[PDB]
């Protein structure tokens, strides 16, 4: 669809991202001096045609309260419809973080960009959840540099030039599966590896999913891959176990996904070839530490809090906010 034109002014001119809703374009804006701006244009299917009328009513409520986007979520500057697909206009934000990552080759972020994202998206997505909203589905792809631009440099350490990013700050995008405290709750939510286990169980969610799914990204970030390399729910749960512990006996008791347990503790054989694969791939979170220095142990004191299993004494983000992590941007 490239040189395609919707609402006689925006031509495209690339892809940015695509995504079971549909696609992301960059187009120029010929009616404000050809400057770039980002388009999310819908398939014409139902279940999409909704979802994008919901993430307009929540982004008509968040540009409201924050015009300026001092809690930086992605600005929408208008929306409209284009042979049957809602098409919303964004600012042009750059790359995702997890796009910032793969074309680093997988390394990791430096930890001190790590605090200042880490700070900004527990800041956004706190702001959600002071309004009644959970994101639900946070992951590396839905946080995007404001300006991906980097310096690069030699790194004798690993041997190989590495891109550091001129300014870090992000925004968090994506609010298609968000949803207000009063609001229908989707039996399923969050992509698989930022996925929180009372979601899995089934036990009910709400604002506490979000904070697993950001423990996650932070690990991510940490380490340049998942500490949940899977596709499937109970080996999912035997990953948790390994690298966090043993479930909490009543969130296994008051599930319903009885083919995950067998008396009241996972069905899993750890001498079976899936169970060599979690010992071989997962481990104590703590054993993924790449320094003893105090800084590293306070991050990993926030992701393990941010980790724990049961929602109701997880760690909220107004309390994540406060962590000594967080000190040195102060
Ligand atoms: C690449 N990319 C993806 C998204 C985006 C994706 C899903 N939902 C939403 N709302 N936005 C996006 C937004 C602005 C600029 C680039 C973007």
């Known amino acids: 669809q490239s040189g395609?034109?919707?609402?006689?002014?925006?031509?495209?001119?690339?892809?940015?991202?695509?995504?079971?809703?549909?696609?992301?374009?960059?187009?120029?804006?010929?009616?404000?001096?050809?400057?770039?701006?980002?388009?999310?244009?819908?398939?014409?299917?139902?279940?999409?045609c909704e979802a994008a009328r919901s993430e307009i009513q929540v982004l008509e409520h968040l540009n409201t309260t924050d015009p300026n986007s001092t809690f930086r979520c992605v600005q929408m500057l208008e929306w409209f419809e284009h042979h049957g697909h809602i098409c919303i206009v964004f600012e042009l934000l750059g790359?995702?973080?997890?796009?910032?990552?793969?074309?680093?080759?997988?390394?990791?972020?430096?930890?001190?960009?790590?605090?200042?994202?880490?700070?900004?998206?527990?800041?956004?997505?706190?702001?959600?959840?002071?309004?009644?909203?959970?994101?639900?589905?946070?992951?590396?792809?839905?946080?995007l540099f404001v300006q991906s631009d980097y310096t690069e440099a030699y790194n004798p350490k690993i041997k190989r030039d590495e891109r550091t990013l001129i300014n870090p700050d992000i925004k968090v995008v994506d609010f298609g599966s968000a949803t207000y405290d009063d609001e229908h709750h989707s039996?399923?939510?969050?992509?698989?590896?930022?996925?929180?286990?009372?979601?899995?169980?089934?036990?009910?969610?709400?604002?506490?999913?979000?904070?697993?799914?950001?423990?996650?990204?932070?690990?991510?970030?940490?380490?340049?891959?998942?500490?949940?390399?899977?596709?499937?729910?109970?080996?999912?749960?035997?990953?948790?176990?390994?690298?966090?512990?043993?479930?909490?006996?009543?969130?296994?008791?008051?599930?319903?996904?009885?083919?995950?347990?067998?008396?009241?503790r996972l069905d899993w054989d750890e001498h079976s070839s899936a169970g060599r694969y979690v010992s071989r791939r997962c481990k104590p979170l703590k054993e993924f530490m790449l320094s003893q220095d105090v800084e590293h142990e306070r991050l990993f004191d926030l992701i393990q809090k941010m980790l724990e299993y049961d929602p109701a004494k997880r760690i909220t983000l107004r309390e994540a906010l406060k962590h000594p992590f967080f000190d040195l941007l102060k």
């Open 4 to 48: 395609d034109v919707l609402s006689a002014r925006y031509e495209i001119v690339d892809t940015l991202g695509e995504g079971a809703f549909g696609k992301v374009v960059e187009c120029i804006d010929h009616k404000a001096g050809g400057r770039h701006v980002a388009v999310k244009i819908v398939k014409n299917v139902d279940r999409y």
């Open 95 to 143: 790359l995702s973080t997890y796009d910032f990552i793969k074309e680093n080759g997988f390394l990791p972020f430096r930890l001190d960009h790590i605090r200042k994202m880490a700070y900004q998206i527990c800041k956004s997505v706190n702001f959600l959840h002071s309004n009644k909203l959970t994101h639900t589905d946070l992951k590396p792809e839905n946080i």
């Open 187 to 264: 039996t399923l939510v969050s992509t698989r590896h930022y996925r929180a286990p009372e979601v899995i169980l089934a036990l009910g969610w709400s604002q506490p999913c979000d904070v697993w799914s950001i423990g996650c990204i932070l690990i991510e970030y940490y380490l340049g891959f998942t500490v949940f390399p899977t596709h499937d729910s109970k080996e999912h749960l035997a990953m948790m176990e390994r690298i966090l512990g043993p479930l909490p006996k009543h969130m296994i008791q008051k599930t319903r996904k009885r083919k995950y347990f067998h008396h009241d």
